[PDB]
Design a protein around this ligand. Sequence first.
Ligand code: CLA
Ligand code: CLA
Ligand code: CLA
Ligand code: CLA
Ligand code: CLA
Ligand SMILES: CC1=C(/C=C/C(C)=C/C=C/C(C)=C/C=C/C=C(C)/C=C/C=C(C)/C=C/C2=C(C)CCCC2(C)C)C(C)(C)CCC1
Ligand SMILES: CC1=C(/C=C/C(C)=C/C=C/C(C)=C/C=C/C=C(C)/C=C/C=C(C)/C=C/C2=C(C)CCCC2(C)C)C(C)(C)CCC1
Ligand SMILES: CC1=C(/C=C/C(C)=C/C=C/C(C)=C/C=C\C=C(C)\C=C\C=C(C)\C=C\C2=C(C)CCCC2(C)C)C(C)(C)CCC1
Ligand SMILES: CC1=C(/C=C/C(C)=C/C=C/C(C)=C/C=C\C=C(C)\C=C\C=C(C)\C=C\C2=C(C)CCCC2(C)C)C(C)(C)CCC1
Ligand SMILES: CC1=C(/C=C/C(C)=C/C=CC(/C)=C/C=C\C=C(C)\C=C/C=C(C)/C=C/C2=C(C)CCCC2(C)C)C(C)(C)CCC1
Ligand code: SF4
Ligand code: SF4
Lengths: 42, 42, 139, 80, 163, 163, 31, 31
Amino acid sequence: MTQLTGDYAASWLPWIMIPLVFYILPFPVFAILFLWIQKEAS
Amino acid sequence: MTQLTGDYAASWLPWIMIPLVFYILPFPVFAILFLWIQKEAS
Amino acid sequence: TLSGQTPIFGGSTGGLLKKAEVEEKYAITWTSPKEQVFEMPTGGAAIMRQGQNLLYLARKEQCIALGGQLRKFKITDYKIYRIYPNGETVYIHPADGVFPEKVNQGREKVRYNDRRIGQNPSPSKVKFSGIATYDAPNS
Amino acid sequence: SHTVKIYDTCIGCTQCVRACPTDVLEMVPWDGCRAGQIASSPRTEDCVGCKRCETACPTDFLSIRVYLGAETTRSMGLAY
Amino acid sequence: NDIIKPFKGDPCLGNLSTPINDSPLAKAFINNLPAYRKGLTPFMRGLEIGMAHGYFLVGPEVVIGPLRESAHGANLSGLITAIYIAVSACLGISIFAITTFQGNPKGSYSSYSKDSLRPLRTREEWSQLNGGIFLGAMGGAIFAYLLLENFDALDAILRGAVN
Amino acid sequence: NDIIKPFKGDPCLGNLSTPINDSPLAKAFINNLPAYRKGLTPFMRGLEIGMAHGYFLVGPEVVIGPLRESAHGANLSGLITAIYIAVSACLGISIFAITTFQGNPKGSYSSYSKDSLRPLRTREEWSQLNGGIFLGAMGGAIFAYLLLENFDALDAILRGAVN
Amino acid sequence: MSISDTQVYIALVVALVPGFLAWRLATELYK
Amino acid sequence: MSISDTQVYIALVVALVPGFLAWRLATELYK
Ligand code: CLA
Ligand code: CLA
Ligand code: CLA
Ligand code: CLA
Ligand code: CLA
Ligand SMILES: CC1=C(/C=C/C(C)=C/C=C/C(C)=C/C=C/C=C(C)/C=C/C=C(C)/C=C/C2=C(C)CCCC2(C)C)C(C)(C)CCC1
Ligand SMILES: CC1=C(/C=C/C(C)=C/C=C/C(C)=C/C=C/C=C(C)/C=C/C=C(C)/C=C/C2=C(C)CCCC2(C)C)C(C)(C)CCC1
Ligand SMILES: CC1=C(/C=C/C(C)=C/C=C/C(C)=C/C=C\C=C(C)\C=C\C=C(C)\C=C\C2=C(C)CCCC2(C)C)C(C)(C)CCC1
Ligand SMILES: CC1=C(/C=C/C(C)=C/C=C/C(C)=C/C=C\C=C(C)\C=C\C=C(C)\C=C\C2=C(C)CCCC2(C)C)C(C)(C)CCC1
Ligand SMILES: CC1=C(/C=C/C(C)=C/C=CC(/C)=C/C=C\C=C(C)\C=C/C=C(C)/C=C/C2=C(C)CCCC2(C)C)C(C)(C)CCC1
Ligand code: SF4
Ligand code: SF4
């Protein structure tokens, strides 16, 4: 075939979550996880 | 018919003034009329 | 000024709002001989302490609602203060140190009309004048 | 900012002062009564307007009138 | 002992210290929302608030709006809804800022108000907020409009149909 | 008596108190234009000035421009005119701000100038103005471009043709 | 024969005369 | 017969229960 499809149920769900957990969410996650490792102990 | 038209002269004029006096101008008018009822007497 | 230990109270939702620290706020201060429980004017119940008690209330009616409850615990040594936001604390109840049911000397007849209420003037008399019919310096 | 006027028909029964939830009224010495007292209203900016003082006055067509006037932040009883 | 305390230890305050408003997770989430994040100019407060709202506000009109039947026209009806809701909202906070900040704001914006749930109390702070909210809600609306009018072109590139 | 007074009561000033500059209506209109509205950051001054101008500047080129004959190409020629007029205008007020604010502005922008018709005298105030004028005149140009390239789709929805 | 195209605009500018005379009077009654 | 369309979403919300119970425990171990 010439596309990514899914015969499995809710085949629309990889369509959005592979972008989410791999190149949309990590930079927010790496920013939150950055703010935690570089906070003053005042 | 399947559209709002006008056989009357200047039939383009309801096309713009019904949006004007009813949902484009009132919020500016209700803002001006709001600034007048809530001004300090200093 | 004012001081005292706050009663045991788990905090309510009916207490002070943004009007407390912006316009003004009230404080009732009483002394109790016993560690009992009283009804909060802002909903709930609190345990009043053994020494000097202090409670912050939003409006004066709550304080005198609570003050009227303290008289049912045989406590008549409470004082009501009014805390303006800048911080000074006025004494407002009892204003002369004795309760208003009692009569002192030195208090003045204020807003007293020396007439029967029946002969207040008609509104046509004070027509287009500053005063109302009930101030009415006649009689 | 209500107006609690007291008229000469008081009998010093003291009942109007007790009913007031906001301590607007208080007794002053007088001579037009056997009680020698009359109500006064020194703290009327505190008047909430409840007219609970008028319910307690026993003189027929009562001696104390609350005259609901300019209503302010403490004469409407707002905690907010 | 009890998990519901008086609000910051004052029993007379009209609130409670509850797991929803005073939790380590809940305080960390709310106090880092752009409305409350420490260290933001009011422009960046409004810019980040604006874009979150312009983005989602084009949705409810392009699929259950009056224009949903067609494709190119649905997106216009959704964008302009976000244009109109935001312009009237940013009209609202320009006239909010004018009418509350007039010498001694009666309420939570007084100088001696000490209120944490609304920290923008200046009219120098509410004017950059208005610009941020506006320019944000406009850019968010356009970005959600560009992503939706190019959905067929975007559905292909997240499916590998473009090789 | 006379309706034309000396300007704010000083006969030596080179102006007159006239129904056009010193009227209750005329002062209320001009002193609430975004250039003069009390309570605006310079960004919101320029943002509101910018959008009013970018919006109308796309007009005179899409109907009497060189591209007016076609439809899709007319709107491009009108948008870019508003892009170019505004970019060169915002280039003008960045270099105005550089060359007038250099220690003691010779003229109406001096420290002791007491002039009401131009209150932006700082170079902290003229830089947010430049950003507002630019981003405003760009968004206004785009919004008038989006409303015009979608005119057939917009003419239908203000005529009920979309049911 | 309905009224012409120009007659509508003539009424628009004529009705602008009582539109401003209302401002004359509303502000003179000290709004 | 593969699992239905709804059964995937049921697992999504069920797996949200150990998703929060992990937050329960990670923060209780004082991250
Ligand atoms: C740890 C077990 C595990 C692993 C290795 C994977 C792996 C994968 N899953 Mg997932 N998934 C799991 C459990 C797991 N799954 C469970 C229990 C559910 C039921 C809710 C799902 C539902 C699910 C959906 C709907 C999808 C995937 C998809 C995928 C694929 C792409 C990554 C992704 O987006 O997932 C997203 C992650 C989730 C949806 C939640 C899974 C997280 C589980 C519950 C816990 C994992 C945390 C782990 C134990 C802690 C280790 C962290 C660190 C110490 C390394 C990938 C092969 C995508 C796919 O189908 O690829 C084509 C897809 O869209 N999974
Ligand atoms: C008070 C009389 C009156 C009333 C009730 C209406 C009512 C209407 N007109 Mg209008 N109109 C009027 C006088 C009036 N007209 C006059 C004298 C003119 C000549 C300039 C016009 C020219 C006109 C046009 C070109 C259009 C309308 C249209 C309309 C319709 C939609 C509302 C609107 O946009 O109008 C807009 C308002 C004006 C154009 C100005 C009219 C205002 C008049 C002159 C004074 C009204 C103020 C009133 C006396 C004060 C009361 C305010 C408050 C105390 C309630 C609506 C049925 C639209 C239509 O055709 O619908 C399909 C349309 O586009 N009218
Ligand atoms: C009446 C209620 C209603 C309706 C009818 C809609 C309808 C719609 N929404 Mg919406 N939404 C709603 C309420 C509603 N929403 C509410 C209450 C929220 C919470 C604020 C949202 C939040 C939301 C988001 C975030 C999105 C939608 C989207 C959509 C569209 C789906 C487009 C699509 O299927 O393929 C297309 C799907 C995509 C193109 C997704 C691609 C990946 C995007 C770019 C990632 C999102 C940005 C990313 C998270 C940035 C990180 C910021 C931060 C959160 C970390 C659709 C028109 C999507 C959209 O607007 O399409 C452009 C979309 O991303 N909605
Ligand atoms: C050479 C002179 C010239 C020429 C050739 C044009 C040509 C044009 N003008 Mg323009 N204009 C000019 C000078 C000129 N103008 C001057 C000197 C001003 C005063 C600043 C304006 C102000 C102006 C405005 C406000 C508008 C135009 C519009 C138009 C376009 C008409 C589009 C149409 O018919 O259907 C389309 C008609 C609409 C889509 C109207 C829909 C309703 C809109 C969204 C309401 C306007 C915003 C609203 C008032 C917001 C409130 C803000 C505040 C004022 C209260 C057209 C290309 C319209 C336009 O740009 O089209 C997008 C338009 O709205 N002109
Ligand atoms: C590579 C350097 C570079 C780049 C990419 C830009 C880019 C930009 N400048 Mg800028 N500028 C620069 C250097 C640069 N500048 C220098 C050295 C000065 C000091 C004289 C300025 C002073 C300046 C002002 C006062 C303003 C800008 C502004 C702008 C923006 C709007 C376009 C414009 O008005 O042109 C204006 C450009 C100049 C006045 C000077 C440009 C001279 C440099 C060396 C560019 C040379 C390019 C080269 C000859 C051609 C290569 C590109 C071409 C082949 C496509 C734009 C993004 C405007 C702005 O603020 O945007 C919001 C504006 O107000 N610039
Ligand atoms: C609470 C919570 C939640 C929720 C969340 C939500 C509610 C959501 C969302 C979301 C959203 C809602 C998001 C969004 C977004 C966005 C964005 C990301 C934007 C953007 C943009 C842009 C980028 C723009 C740009 C521009 C401009 C600015 C101008 C020009 C044009 C353009 C377009 C270029 C949950 C439960 C899940 C979990 C967590 C917590
Ligand atoms: C003097 C006067 C006059 C005149 C006036 C004029 C001159 C006019 C006008 C007007 C105008 C001229 C108006 C306008 C406007 C506008 C607007 C309303 C705008 C807008 C916009 C927007 C909303 C944008 C947005 C955006 C952005 C920002 C970015 C992204 C993209 C977008 C598009 C989203 C008369 C005589 C009548 C009367 C009164 C007085
Ligand atoms: C920060 C924030 C925000 C805000 C919001 C706000 C703060 C607002 C507001 C606003 C406002 C503040 C508004 C409004 C309004 C006004 C109105 C709505 C009015 C009116 C009117 C009327 C109704 C009138 C009536 C009258 C009078 C009174 C006079 C005489 C005559 C008559 C009867 C006509 C947003 C969401 C954006 C964003 C995010 C966050
Ligand atoms: C605020 C405003 C504004 C403003 C404007 C302005 C303020 C401006 C300006 C500007 C400017 C300030 C400009 C300009 C310019 C410059 C020029 C135009 C030049 C030149 C040149 C030349 C011509 C040269 C010559 C020469 C020389 C001298 C050297 C040697 C050689 C030669 C011979 C070459 C706007 C409208 C935007 C907006 C609204 C309001
Ligand atoms: C210039 C021109 C033009 C344009 C026009 C227009 C666009 C317009 C407008 C406008 C209009 C369409 C208007 C009107 C009006 C209004 C009115 C007429 C009003 C009113 C009212 C009244 C009557 C008032 C009343 C009162 C009083 C008496 C006092 C106080 C209270 C009140 C407010 C109720 C044309 C092109 C054609 C031609 C050429 C140039
Ligand atoms: S006002 Fe009424 S209640 Fe008060 S003392 Fe006089 S008679 Fe008694
Ligand atoms: S109205 Fe109420 S508060 Fe006022 S004097 Fe009468 S009883 Fe007291």
